[PDB]
A = this chain, B = another copy of it.
Amino acid sequence: FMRFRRAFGEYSHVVAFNTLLFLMSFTVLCLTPVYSFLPGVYSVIYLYLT
């Protein structure tokens, strides 16, 4: 993490959060066609969390 903060300057805070959100959404999308509940409730959870 110390090595990571050396690059990307001030924008590392934005980059890390964007990557984390993309990775969180990717797992849900990959797990979508087994539990059909996820596309509905996950959108509400994301809206509340944002």
Find A2's partner among B2, B5, B9 (CB 8 Å cutoff): B9
Which residues from B are CB-within-8-Å of A10?
2
A8 beta carbon closer than 8 Å to chain B: yes
Q: Which of A1-50 contact B (CB under 8 A)?
A: 1-2, 5, 7-11
Q: In whole angstroms, what is the CA distance A2 to B2 when docked?
A: 18
A23 to chain B, nearest CB (A): 22
Which residues from B are CB-within-8-Å of A9?
2, 5
Q: In whole angstroms, what is the CA distance A7 to B2 when docked?
A: 9
**7 sample A-B contacts, Cβ–Cβ < 8 Å, listed by A number:** A1-B11, A2-B7, A2-B8, A2-B9, A2-B10, A2-B11, A5-B9
